[PDB]
Design a protein around this ligand. Structure first.
Ligand code: HEM
Length: 180
């Protein structure tokens, strides 16, 4: 299901609150009703002199499999957003497959504070949208998002009641992969 094109980042957001620690997805919204598998995800995003690089993990809770990626792209000047190319790696961060140059994801930060964040991700394989997802993020696994971030969900035109909560899925994480 094609990504929403009604996305732009929150202006004036504090990038130091976003590029910090690791994030766990506590709640995700993929509106596509053809989806069946539910995921857990965690990642650790960094930024140095305009270049964003992040280590990313997905766990397919239905199939009990996982995959790892490294994303890299430029920080937009117009707001807290980046379009990254991604490599596939193993749990030891060894490269399995270099980036396919036709593929990218755009991550747009909608809110970020010291405990929590809200972001939108659209993954593209050339001219095909793989899909988009909104993710509520916290620094501690199974934590509660802040009131500020909950407000951002509503103000994005969304309803938290429709998100899938990950705390009850039986997630397996790889905390070593996302550690400082
Ligand atoms: C719980 C939240 C998330 C869910 C439900 C989700 C879901 C998915 C799904 C279903 C796929 C396709 C898997 C496949 O068929 O191979 C995928 C791939 C991908 N996702 Fe996510 N995702 C989540 C969070 C994220 C986050 C936070 C990021 C970036 C920071 C991200 C970036 C990507 C990328 C780059 C791919 C392509 C990976 C590859 O082909 O190697 N996703 N995701």
């Amino acid at each position: 299901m094609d990504c929403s094109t009604n996305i732009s980042p929150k202006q004036g957001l504090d990038k130091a609150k976003y590029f910090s620690g690791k994030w766990y997805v506590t709640h995700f919204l993929d509106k596509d009703p053809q989806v069946t598998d539910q995921y857990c995800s965690s990642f650790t995003p960094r930024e140095s002199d305009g270049t964003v690089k992040e280590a990313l993990y997905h766990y397919n809770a239905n199939k009990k499999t996982s995959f790892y990626n490294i994303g890299e792209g430029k920080l937009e000047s117009s707001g807290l957003q980046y379009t990254a190319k991604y490599k596939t790696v193993d749990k030891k961060k060894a490269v399995l497959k270099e980036a396919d140059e036709k593929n990218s994801y755009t991550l747009t930060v909608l809110e970020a504070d010291d405990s929590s964040a809200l972001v939108h991700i659209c993954v593209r394989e050339g001219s095909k949208d793989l899909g988009d997802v909104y993710t509520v993020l916290t620094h501690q696994k199974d934590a509660e998002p802040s009131a500020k971030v909950k407000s951002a969900v509503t103000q994005a035109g969304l309803q938290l009641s429709q998100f899938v909560g990950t705390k009850d899925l039986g997630c397996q994480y790889d905390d070593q992969f996302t550690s400082l």
